[PDB]
Amino acid sequence: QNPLDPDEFRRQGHMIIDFLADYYKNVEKYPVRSQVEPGYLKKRLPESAPYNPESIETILEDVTNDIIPGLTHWQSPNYFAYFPSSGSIAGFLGEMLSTGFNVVGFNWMSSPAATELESIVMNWLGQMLTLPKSFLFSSDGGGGGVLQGTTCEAILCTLTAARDKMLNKIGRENINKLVVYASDQTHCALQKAAQIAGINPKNVRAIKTSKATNFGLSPNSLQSAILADIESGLVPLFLCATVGTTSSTAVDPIGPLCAVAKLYGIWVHIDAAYAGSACICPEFRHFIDGVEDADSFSLNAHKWFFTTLDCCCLWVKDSDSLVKALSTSPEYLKNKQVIDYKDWQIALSRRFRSMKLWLVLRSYGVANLRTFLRSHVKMAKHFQGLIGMDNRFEIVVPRTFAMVCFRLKPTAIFKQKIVDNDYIEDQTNEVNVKLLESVNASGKIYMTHAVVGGVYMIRFAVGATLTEERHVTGAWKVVQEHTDAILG
Amino acid sequence: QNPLDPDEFRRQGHMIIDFLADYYKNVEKYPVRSQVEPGYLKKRLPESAPYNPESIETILEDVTNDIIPGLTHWQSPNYFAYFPSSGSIAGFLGEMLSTGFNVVGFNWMSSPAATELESIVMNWLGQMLTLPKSFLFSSDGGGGGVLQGTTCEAILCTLTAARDKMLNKIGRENINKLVVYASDQTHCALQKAAQIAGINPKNVRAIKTSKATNFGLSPNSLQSAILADIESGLVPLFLCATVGTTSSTAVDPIGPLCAVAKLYGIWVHIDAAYAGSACICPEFRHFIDGVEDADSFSLNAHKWFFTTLDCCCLWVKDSDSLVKALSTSPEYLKNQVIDYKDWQIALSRRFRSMKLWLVLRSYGVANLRTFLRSHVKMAKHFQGLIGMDNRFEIVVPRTFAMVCFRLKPTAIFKQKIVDNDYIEDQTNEVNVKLLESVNASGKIYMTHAVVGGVYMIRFAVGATLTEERHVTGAWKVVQEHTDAILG
Ligand SMILES: Cc1ncc(COP(=O)(O)O)c(CN[C@@H](Cc2ccc(O)cc2)C(=O)O)c1O
Ligand SMILES: N[C@@H](Cc1ccc(O)cc1)C(=O)O
């Protein structure tokens, strides 16, 4: 009858829960990387909507037969690609409570709980991160934090804030002279955000890094680029320093970076999308030292903090700049020192995201969360040791968190006393391409690659919530079998 | 043990299904608009995270005692504020499946099903809307559609596409001469997009509208604006025409607006966030006549299409512009298909096509039409109830399922004098009092609008749980509070 019948809700919801419990019980059974051909689904499904209803049972049969073959199982214990899609029972339950309530929190009045819980919970997490008080919500009133969907949106919001702060002082006609700084390892979330914000594409500086800094941004290189831009009559605006780059999880030195930036009034945003969460543990916190000298800081709680997709956390030292850049107060939504979160982000409508984070924190506790992260790190260390037992491979850059970067060495295919050169390195790159593709095609595990300084290398990024030690051991076994077979 | 243990997952998920089923069974009892004081919740929760774990039973108890009181119940059958937060069992189940797979679909490779099902379902819905083929996916590989979070994101995307397509021709130094046209009813989501995209604030025209066109944008006003801007040496760029404005669900006339725009190469985006869904019914398709002469089209399926929050559908005639303005080619995501990362803002995508797929499959075209028609019918009934009471008037015509009404000036002025500014101000104050009294009762919730100076009350009916009796009881509450204010 009604699409929100409570009893039908109970029934079908129980059905879907059983379905997902089965899926988690069975996921290790599928090939990690989808093995379908492009366009398979367009062929297997109808071309128009149904006129009459269809049973939920039918739709679930179709989910099993048609959808799942087309999934890359990010939550498989044998998923090691990109960065983890960190999920959890608590995260799922928080998402489902938010979707059940289905409220729209664009201002305080549309649901006081959404806004106030988000404030409380961001303070919680930021305190766990031991962020400086200048970034948290002061009860005596400055700083503050907000939940957004993605890192790209957080960078876009802080970039727009910086842009408007500067152009209000010097005049919009300088918009095409504004310069954004990052490293050549910096995630594309930055150049996309710069494009959308109207920064001229000639003024996004991907500063060159090298093995001498383990591909972190050199402060001397940043200062040279800044001085060149000043000499050309341009306007330095924004630096995006990164903790845990996508390629090799390199780590930028935030302290000296901000020290250079303050010399020129540059806004500094800290992209710690993946690695940020590890900083709740005392032994990892040093990676974000100097954050106190930066202007904004973000992490992706869905990459390594079990929330489920999606939940990016953005803390700012000067929330008024966010608000001023993004604010619009029409009359339909005006109908007191409250927070209107629509003025902190892109979207007007907002999802009750604080629920996921709240439920994760409460269900597991700081101790168990730290244990989870340390489990991932210990598994990565174990993988690196296994590699250390095979002189055919090397570690290309130091393991900073739970990602290991490795490759077959040149001496694994060139049995000669010849000095390295470009051709030898290219052929080594080729055999590593071949090895990774063979492994992925097996379907037993899934890893992605990255090129740093011309060296092509394989990333083992362990963090899937279901992963256990045996999956690490088995993954190494698979790499070794495919190595043996490729090298005869 | 494991934070994703399947047994514990099954147990706590069943518990949560039951908790939410009880919520829907009992939601009618809470005051619709939240009644808590600002700062209420901080007082009740700890100021730091817990070091030890906490039972899900305890968390659920805290949700009942601490969270729900701070909710404004968008899904109460007596909620008629803003526009509906339209949901359904099917949408909830689609979101469940999405979150349970928890896959990121920035690549096709990162989960072909996400990408392909999104394309298929956008075709389905565009076909139900009778969108021109120029807006849908060619089976042979022209146009196409993408799911997103909000209408603001859709407008930001199309505006970025138009901006970059223009500046690629004339040079980025002209960014400060690009003009964006809208009506003075146009949702602020457009002004925000213009600010973000670098459009100069002096160059967003909020063209004035009057009761003469029921506050729809007039082609002659738009053309005067565009000509004046051309005379100033500015560069007209982008028009946002709205079908179903927030304030009074006015309807800009897409046809002649596009005819004016095409004379100047202006990109036309059709914002149909709320009313767009209604066009899956034949009798409503006329509201988007001339969409074929436009450049992009969007609606919010979470407003009037039962998907759950959130889902905004955006179609375009030229996806190449979208991709060329939003494209990035990075080395970390490679080793002919759609890569939707180049169609929207973020790299990460939610498996959003599952919500829409489940809604369409679970209900059907016929039943969805009947749902929307029921909302429209309840709105007609509320309008007739108003008609039975000569203290009230209908300020503008009902286009969809929202009725805009007010206490007439003759309800508070016995005098037989010609209307003037003071009388209208006092009538506004009376209607303010009426709306705030109604809303503070907690029994129902409506929001206000101001069109051409006149302050009026919106009855926007479309919550999934609303029945005829809720409409009737809403009118009873309005009349009781009116008598209490007058006699
Ligand atoms: C014409 C138009 N465009 C856009 C929007 C909203 O754009 P976003 O996707 O960025 O949110 C609205 C509704 N605006 C109201 C009403 C509303 C009602 C229900 C919802 O689920 C969402 C919004 C509001 O957001 O305040 C609108 O009427
Ligand atoms: N953004 C990540 C992919 C990713 C996103 C979200 C996740 O939860 C996990 C991984 C990348 O570029 O590699």
Short mmCIF file of N, CA and C in Angstrom, two decimals, chain B residues 80-161:
data_model
loop_
_atom_site.label_atom_id
_atom_site.label_comp_id
_atom_site.label_asym_id
_atom_site.label_seq_id
_atom_site.Cartn_x
_atom_site.Cartn_y
_atom_site.Cartn_z
N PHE B 80 4.88 19.74 6.76
CA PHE B 80 4.57 20.41 5.50
C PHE B 80 5.50 21.60 5.25
N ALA B 81 6.66 21.63 5.91
CA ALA B 81 7.61 22.72 5.77
C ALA B 81 8.50 22.53 4.54
N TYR B 82 9.10 23.64 4.10
CA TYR B 82 10.01 23.66 2.96
C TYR B 82 9.49 22.80 1.81
N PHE B 83 10.23 21.76 1.47
CA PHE B 83 9.79 20.70 0.57
C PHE B 83 10.02 19.36 1.24
N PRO B 84 9.30 18.32 0.83
CA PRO B 84 9.38 17.04 1.54
C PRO B 84 10.78 16.44 1.49
N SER B 85 11.12 15.73 2.56
CA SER B 85 12.25 14.81 2.54
C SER B 85 11.67 13.43 2.22
N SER B 86 11.39 13.23 0.93
CA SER B 86 10.64 12.08 0.46
C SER B 86 11.47 10.81 0.58
N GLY B 87 10.95 9.82 1.30
CA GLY B 87 11.62 8.55 1.44
C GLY B 87 10.65 7.39 1.26
N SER B 88 11.20 6.19 1.37
CA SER B 88 10.40 4.99 1.20
C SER B 88 11.19 3.81 1.72
N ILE B 89 10.48 2.70 1.92
CA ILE B 89 11.15 1.44 2.21
C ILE B 89 12.19 1.14 1.14
N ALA B 90 11.81 1.25 -0.13
CA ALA B 90 12.72 0.90 -1.22
C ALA B 90 13.98 1.76 -1.19
N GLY B 91 13.82 3.07 -1.00
CA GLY B 91 14.99 3.93 -0.93
C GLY B 91 15.89 3.57 0.24
N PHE B 92 15.29 3.30 1.40
CA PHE B 92 16.07 2.88 2.55
C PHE B 92 16.85 1.61 2.24
N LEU B 93 16.22 0.65 1.57
CA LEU B 93 16.90 -0.61 1.27
C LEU B 93 18.02 -0.39 0.26
N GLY B 94 17.81 0.49 -0.71
CA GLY B 94 18.89 0.81 -1.64
C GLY B 94 20.08 1.43 -0.94
N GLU B 95 19.82 2.37 -0.02
CA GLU B 95 20.90 2.95 0.76
C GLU B 95 21.58 1.90 1.64
N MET B 96 20.79 0.98 2.20
CA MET B 96 21.36 -0.11 2.98
C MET B 96 22.34 -0.91 2.14
N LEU B 97 21.90 -1.35 0.97
CA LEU B 97 22.77 -2.12 0.08
C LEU B 97 24.02 -1.34 -0.28
N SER B 98 23.86 -0.08 -0.67
CA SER B 98 25.02 0.74 -0.99
C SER B 98 26.02 0.76 0.17
N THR B 99 25.56 1.18 1.35
CA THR B 99 26.44 1.28 2.51
C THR B 99 27.01 -0.07 2.91
N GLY B 100 26.30 -1.16 2.64
CA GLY B 100 26.76 -2.47 3.03
C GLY B 100 27.86 -2.98 2.13
N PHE B 101 27.75 -2.70 0.83
CA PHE B 101 28.86 -2.99 -0.07
C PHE B 101 30.01 -2.01 0.15
N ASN B 102 29.69 -0.76 0.47
CA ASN B 102 30.68 0.27 0.77
C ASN B 102 31.82 0.27 -0.25
N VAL B 103 31.45 0.42 -1.52
CA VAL B 103 32.41 0.51 -2.61
C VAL B 103 32.49 1.95 -3.10
N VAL B 104 33.68 2.35 -3.53
CA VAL B 104 33.92 3.67 -4.09
C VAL B 104 33.99 3.54 -5.60
N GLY B 105 33.19 4.34 -6.31
CA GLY B 105 33.10 4.20 -7.75
C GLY B 105 33.59 5.39 -8.55
N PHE B 106 34.81 5.86 -8.26
CA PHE B 106 35.40 6.91 -9.07
C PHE B 106 35.83 6.39 -10.44
N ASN B 107 36.23 5.12 -10.51
CA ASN B 107 36.49 4.40 -11.74
C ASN B 107 35.27 3.58 -12.13
N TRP B 108 35.20 3.23 -13.41
CA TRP B 108 34.42 2.05 -13.79
C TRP B 108 35.01 0.81 -13.13
N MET B 109 36.33 0.66 -13.23
CA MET B 109 37.00 -0.51 -12.68
C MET B 109 36.76 -0.65 -11.18
N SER B 110 36.61 0.47 -10.46
CA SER B 110 36.42 0.40 -9.01
C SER B 110 35.07 -0.18 -8.62
N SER B 111 34.16 -0.37 -9.58
CA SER B 111 32.96 -1.18 -9.42
C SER B 111 32.05 -0.97 -10.63
N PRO B 112 32.26 -1.72 -11.71
CA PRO B 112 31.47 -1.46 -12.93
C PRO B 112 29.98 -1.34 -12.69
N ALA B 113 29.43 -2.09 -11.73
CA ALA B 113 27.99 -2.04 -11.48
C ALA B 113 27.53 -0.64 -11.10
N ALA B 114 28.26 0.03 -10.20
CA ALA B 114 27.89 1.39 -9.82
C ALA B 114 27.74 2.29 -11.04
N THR B 115 28.81 2.41 -11.83
CA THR B 115 28.78 3.23 -13.04
C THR B 115 27.64 2.84 -13.99
N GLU B 116 27.60 1.56 -14.38
CA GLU B 116 26.65 1.15 -15.41
C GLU B 116 25.20 1.26 -14.92
N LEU B 117 24.92 0.82 -13.69
CA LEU B 117 23.57 0.95 -13.15
C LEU B 117 23.15 2.40 -13.04
N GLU B 118 24.08 3.29 -12.69
CA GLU B 118 23.74 4.70 -12.69
C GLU B 118 23.29 5.16 -14.07
N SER B 119 24.08 4.84 -15.10
CA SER B 119 23.68 5.22 -16.46
C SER B 119 22.29 4.67 -16.81
N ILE B 120 22.08 3.38 -16.55
CA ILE B 120 20.82 2.73 -16.91
C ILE B 120 19.65 3.41 -16.22
N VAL B 121 19.80 3.68 -14.92
CA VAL B 121 18.69 4.23 -14.15
C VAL B 121 18.42 5.68 -14.54
N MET B 122 19.47 6.44 -14.87
CA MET B 122 19.26 7.79 -15.38
C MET B 122 18.50 7.76 -16.69
N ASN B 123 18.81 6.80 -17.56
CA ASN B 123 18.01 6.65 -18.77
C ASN B 123 16.56 6.33 -18.44
N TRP B 124 16.34 5.37 -17.53
CA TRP B 124 14.98 5.02 -17.13
C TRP B 124 14.19 6.26 -16.71
N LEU B 125 14.76 7.04 -15.79
CA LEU B 125 14.04 8.17 -15.23
C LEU B 125 13.86 9.28 -16.25
N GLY B 126 14.91 9.58 -17.02
CA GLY B 126 14.77 10.54 -18.10
C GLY B 126 13.70 10.16 -19.10
N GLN B 127 13.54 8.86 -19.36
CA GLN B 127 12.49 8.39 -20.25
C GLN B 127 11.12 8.58 -19.61
N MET B 128 11.00 8.29 -18.31
CA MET B 128 9.74 8.56 -17.62
C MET B 128 9.39 10.04 -17.65
N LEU B 129 10.39 10.91 -17.69
CA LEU B 129 10.16 12.35 -17.76
C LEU B 129 9.91 12.86 -19.18
N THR B 130 10.17 12.05 -20.20
CA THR B 130 10.06 12.49 -21.59
C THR B 130 11.14 13.51 -21.94
N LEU B 131 12.25 13.47 -21.23
CA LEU B 131 13.38 14.28 -21.63
C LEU B 131 13.75 13.96 -23.07
N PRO B 132 14.19 14.95 -23.85
CA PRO B 132 14.62 14.66 -25.21
C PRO B 132 15.77 13.66 -25.19
N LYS B 133 15.88 12.90 -26.28
CA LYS B 133 16.99 11.95 -26.38
C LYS B 133 18.33 12.66 -26.28
N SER B 134 18.40 13.91 -26.72
CA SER B 134 19.65 14.66 -26.62
C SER B 134 20.16 14.75 -25.19
N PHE B 135 19.33 14.41 -24.20
CA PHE B 135 19.69 14.42 -22.79
C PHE B 135 20.06 13.05 -22.25
N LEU B 136 19.81 11.99 -23.01
CA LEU B 136 19.95 10.62 -22.52
C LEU B 136 21.13 9.93 -23.20
N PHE B 137 21.50 8.78 -22.65
CA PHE B 137 22.65 8.05 -23.18
C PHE B 137 22.29 7.40 -24.51
N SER B 138 23.03 7.75 -25.56
CA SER B 138 22.92 7.04 -26.82
C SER B 138 23.31 5.59 -26.61
N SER B 139 22.45 4.67 -27.06
CA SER B 139 22.79 3.25 -26.97
C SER B 139 24.08 2.95 -27.71
N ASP B 140 24.40 3.72 -28.74
CA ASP B 140 25.59 3.55 -29.56
C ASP B 140 26.82 4.27 -29.00
N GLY B 141 26.69 4.97 -27.88
CA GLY B 141 27.78 5.78 -27.36
C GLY B 141 27.99 7.05 -28.17
N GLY B 142 26.36 11.32 -27.13
CA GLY B 142 25.76 12.65 -27.15
C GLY B 142 25.61 13.27 -25.77
N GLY B 143 24.46 13.02 -25.14
CA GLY B 143 24.17 13.52 -23.82
C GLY B 143 24.31 12.46 -22.76
N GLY B 144 23.72 12.72 -21.60
CA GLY B 144 23.75 11.74 -20.54
C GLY B 144 23.48 12.36 -19.19
N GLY B 145 23.34 11.48 -18.19
CA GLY B 145 22.97 11.90 -16.86
C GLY B 145 23.90 11.33 -15.81
N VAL B 146 23.94 12.03 -14.68
CA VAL B 146 24.80 11.70 -13.55
C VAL B 146 24.04 11.97 -12.25
N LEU B 147 24.27 11.11 -11.27
CA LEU B 147 23.74 11.31 -9.93
C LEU B 147 24.72 12.14 -9.12
N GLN B 148 24.17 12.94 -8.21
CA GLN B 148 24.97 13.79 -7.35
C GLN B 148 24.24 13.92 -6.02
N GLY B 149 24.81 14.71 -5.13
CA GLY B 149 24.20 14.93 -3.83
C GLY B 149 23.10 15.98 -3.85
N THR B 150 23.41 17.18 -4.36
CA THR B 150 22.54 18.34 -4.20
C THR B 150 22.34 19.06 -5.52
N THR B 151 21.33 19.93 -5.53
CA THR B 151 21.13 20.82 -6.67
C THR B 151 22.25 21.84 -6.77
N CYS B 152 22.80 22.26 -5.63
CA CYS B 152 23.93 23.17 -5.68
C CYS B 152 25.10 22.55 -6.43
N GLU B 153 25.36 21.26 -6.20
CA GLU B 153 26.45 20.60 -6.91
C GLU B 153 26.15 20.53 -8.41
N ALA B 154 24.91 20.22 -8.79
CA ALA B 154 24.57 20.16 -10.21
C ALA B 154 24.76 21.52 -10.87
N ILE B 155 24.31 22.59 -10.21
CA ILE B 155 24.43 23.91 -10.80
C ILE B 155 25.88 24.33 -10.87
N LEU B 156 26.66 24.04 -9.82
CA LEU B 156 28.09 24.32 -9.85
C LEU B 156 28.76 23.59 -11.01
N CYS B 157 28.38 22.34 -11.25
CA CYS B 157 28.99 21.59 -12.35
C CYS B 157 28.65 22.22 -13.70
N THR B 158 27.36 22.45 -13.96
CA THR B 158 26.99 23.00 -15.27
C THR B 158 27.56 24.41 -15.45
N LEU B 159 27.61 25.19 -14.37
CA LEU B 159 28.15 26.54 -14.47
C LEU B 159 29.65 26.51 -14.72
N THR B 160 30.37 25.60 -14.06
CA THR B 160 31.78 25.42 -14.36
C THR B 160 31.98 25.01 -15.82
N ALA B 161 31.15 24.10 -16.32
CA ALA B 161 31.26 23.69 -17.71
C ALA B 161 31.06 24.89 -18.64
#
